[PDB]
Design an enzyme around this catalytic site. Structure first.
Site, PDB file in Angstrom:
ATOM      1  N   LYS A   2       1.164   4.401   7.255  1.00  0.00           N
ATOM      2  CA  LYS A   2       0.538   5.231   6.257  1.00  0.00           C
ATOM      3  C   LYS A   2       1.060   6.615   6.425  1.00  0.00           C
ATOM      4  O   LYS A   2       1.758   6.928   7.383  1.00  0.00           O
ATOM      5  CB  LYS A   2      -0.995   5.239   6.422  1.00  0.00           C
ATOM      6  CG  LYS A   2      -1.704   3.926   6.093  1.00  0.00           C
ATOM      7  CD  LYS A   2      -1.686   3.649   4.607  1.00  0.00           C
ATOM      8  CE  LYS A   2      -2.364   2.337   4.246  1.00  0.00           C
ATOM      9  NZ  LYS A   2      -1.520   1.178   4.632  1.00  0.00           N
ATOM     10  N   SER A  14       0.849  -1.187   0.000  1.00  0.00           N
ATOM     11  CA  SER A  14       0.000   0.000   0.000  1.00  0.00           C
ATOM     12  C   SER A  14       0.885   1.239   0.000  1.00  0.00           C
ATOM     13  O   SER A  14       0.408   2.358  -0.165  1.00  0.00           O
ATOM     14  CB  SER A  14      -0.882   0.013   1.259  1.00  0.00           C
ATOM     15  OG  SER A  14      -0.127   0.089   2.461  1.00  0.00           O
TER      16      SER A  14
END
Lengths: 105, 106
Positions: free
Chosen positions: A66, A29
């Site tokens: 993230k 990701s």
């Protein structure tokens, strides 16, 4: 005459030895951001995250790595076109555990 | 007359509000210990782990919820017969991030 100072990675890469740990990244990701499944992320838990920083965080009790967005809204965004962002609304809990300072590939 | 004193989970379950967070357990490497996939684990990062405590730890950069064993050797042991222990040798790195103080099932 010269004296060879051996290499010391801790002095080179770690500002806060006592508040720094390594997390292995997972999935992809975050590939466009230079992180790939397997890398070691060097995390500094003594520095306060900022808009833009890449952080180890827990959203609703589940851990992730993230990119932190504080504006226009608080979110956790990937760095892989395939993935979609995560907004941190009032019914959501965000927990930031440190700022990724280096990626060891 | 009498005035009903509203329930307050944080005072009841949390000793160190500023060093406490919740993690959601995964898989069932810890069912015989009361933890099942999905439960919230209330974690206190302000108390130092002890032999026997269940903790949130990272072994070689990978997080886990396991039971800490400091004797006879340093290990991370499951609580499910199907799973096998994890020894923390010199070539391995163990990082303990907090002691699970409560498990909240639903």
């Amino acid at each position: 005459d010269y004296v060879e100072q051996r290499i010391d990675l801790n002095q080179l890469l770690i500002q806060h030895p006592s508040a720094t740990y390594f997390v292995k990244a997972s999935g992809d990701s975050m590939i466009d951001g230079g992180i790939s499944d397997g890398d070691l992320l060097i995390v500094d838990s003594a520095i306060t995250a900022s808009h833009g920083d890449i952080v180890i965080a827990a959203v609703d009790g589940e851990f992730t790595v993230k990119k932190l967005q504080l504006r226009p809204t608080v979110q956790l965004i990937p760095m892989n076109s395939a993935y979609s962002p995560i907004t941190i609304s009032s019914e959501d809990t965000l927990d930031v555990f440190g700022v990724v300072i280096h990626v060891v590939k």
